[PDB]
Amino acid sequence: TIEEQAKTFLDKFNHEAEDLFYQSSLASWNYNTNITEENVQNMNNAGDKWSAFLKEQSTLAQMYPLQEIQNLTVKLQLQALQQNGSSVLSEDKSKRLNTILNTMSTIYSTGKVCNPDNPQECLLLEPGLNEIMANSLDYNERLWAWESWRSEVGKQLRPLYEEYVVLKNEMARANHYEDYGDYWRGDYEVNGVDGYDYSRGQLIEDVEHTFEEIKPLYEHLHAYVRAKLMNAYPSYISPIGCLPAHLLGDMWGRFWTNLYSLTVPFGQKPNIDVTDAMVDQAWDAQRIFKEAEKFFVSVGLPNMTQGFWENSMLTDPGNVQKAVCHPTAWDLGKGDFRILMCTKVTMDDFLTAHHEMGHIQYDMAYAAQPFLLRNGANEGFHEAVGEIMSLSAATPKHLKSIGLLSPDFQEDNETEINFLLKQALTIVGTLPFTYMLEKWRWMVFKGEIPKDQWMKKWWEMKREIVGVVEPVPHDETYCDPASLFHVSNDYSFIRYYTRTLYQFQFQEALCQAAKHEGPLHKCDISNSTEAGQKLFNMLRLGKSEPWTLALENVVGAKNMNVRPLLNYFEPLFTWLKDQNKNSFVGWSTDWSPYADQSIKVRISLKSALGDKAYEWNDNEMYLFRSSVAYAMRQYFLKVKNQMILFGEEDVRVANLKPRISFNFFVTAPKNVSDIIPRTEVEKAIRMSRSRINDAFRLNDNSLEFLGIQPT
């Protein structure tokens, strides 16, 4: 043999798979290098061939139950090829799920938001909305883009996401899994290994445990950013409350990188920018790439394949030639390692070269593994490798020895605090975001969060874990999570969390081998074979061994530790604590940007009706919002003589309770930013209170408009 026949099968499979895979990869490389319809067909046909081939081999693998298989190598390859996947779903189920996935992706990519001022001017997220969320400092403009993105596209995804969840769970359950969340936690799962075994549930525990150890540092970062944002947005942020979600420097608040302009610790101090030195010393793309190669060779990593240098888009075509330009390492196969990128004479491009080449080095190292066992130990191993490369290369030390930063300069601790904060805005800023998002998805997939509480718990978790508050209350007609790419495009997210940890663990371990004496934030692993050796040990492993074992290969551990991450930001932490001495380190999950003008309303049907007391449903609520809108119109047209067309949609309801108590506020007919002041709303209610009471067969006593009273 069973194992013998299984091994024989895998052997034959691998021989054909590697070759056909190469053809597909080469075809894709060609089309990426030259965007042509002919090339489209080439890559498409090649991809179809490999996919069909893999499917047939998948069934053949099923004919070899891994239970009888004792050899781990064959067992691992069998298990990987064996995986049925969505194929377990019925034809109708599979087709529907695929349609939902395409619809969701299309809505995300083609969804548009029109300016309320001019309906003709409509912005897409990718270019316009992102620019506003990353550059605009207008509270109103940022609020518009944030809410409009969720109000237009988020609703379109709500029903699709619901079906998606159902079908996804079915498929995974049929693939022997508790839920789609468990299906996704299978990546980090290790079995039949002595001490290197790891449960899918273990991941959850580990993530949560590690997260609790980072909370302190993040709280200080949050408090510091809040203080600075209070200056940028006065009369908008509570010094003890959460942070408005539309002010985090992007559409979702994934990264806080765009908040640096408003949070620079030492404005007077700049940061290292050797792009000028590069251009001054005529640093072409090839030169910068050689520097990358030099660095790797310095740490004792194999020389870049001559083939790489031969076939690799290392610079923009510039001519009629049309080629995509995203930095990407290519393992075309059969010893083919290429890099495609529109490289320029920039410090960023220099570091990107190191990052991309880092992936190539990993590929080359595991290229000698079984075709199916040629990949990073887990989904967070490969990216971490690239990251630690850029880390060591960015160090002013490295640049001063790369001949870009005159070593006569002296690195200022202020510029170090500057650098550390900028990194924290990208690294520490995404950790709660990533944690909370995966947590929500996991609970949703396992059913812990019901459909009627999807948005409810989303914002509860946001306010508690991330310390971020919604500027506008979002009911279960919204799907805020689905408005993010990964969610709408069926991608796991815990990779990002785990990678971050792994990256710092790797960096520290390697620097210990490099015999670093200073702050880890300024460590250059260049010129250290020992660091390279440890790195290589894991690098060459691939998927052959458990990720827990590969960890022990470099860091020596089997699980993700956050200590090294904290160690890296320790200087910043100490500094932040000083700045947050006077400030309140923490947030209250009660303050909201709309609570100030929110009117609490308690309703007593049974008090005024007893028997024949109708059940307050959404229809009753719809009626209420309509009644309030009516009141607002009357008040404005009478007191202000202003014909303002207030609709039930302008009436924003929140904190609905079984007491039939809720907080509500009124906005301008087409202006989320323009919140009608509570004073005016109170007057409007007073004016039409009787009418509203009549509509619900209630009275001032039963229809308690807290803050409004009879006289």
């Binding site: 308690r602 008090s607 007491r659 108590s661």
Partner: protein
């Protein structure tokens, strides 16, 4: 009922102290921020009236409760 925003009619004469006990279990801190007058009925019965109060206060008030209050 207002403190925990519970559905109207859930708390009765029977499920009241136990209700607030389970309610304190949920909100122990808030439970201490809620005044609660003491109801006895016997204490109400054992409250002495002021002189002439019985006729021009007790009876007068009871009649207001009675229907066709002017008749009585």
């Amino acid at each position: 009922i207002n403190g925990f925003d519970l559905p109207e009619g859930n708390v009765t004469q029977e499920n009241f102290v136990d209700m607030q006990q389970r309610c304190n279990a949920s909100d122990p801190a808030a439970y201490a921020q809620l005044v609660f007058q003491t109801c006895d009925i016997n204490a109400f019965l054992s409250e002495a009236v002021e002189g002439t109060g019985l006729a021009f206060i007790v009876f007068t008030e009871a009649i207001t409760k009675m229907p066709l209050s002017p008749l009585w």
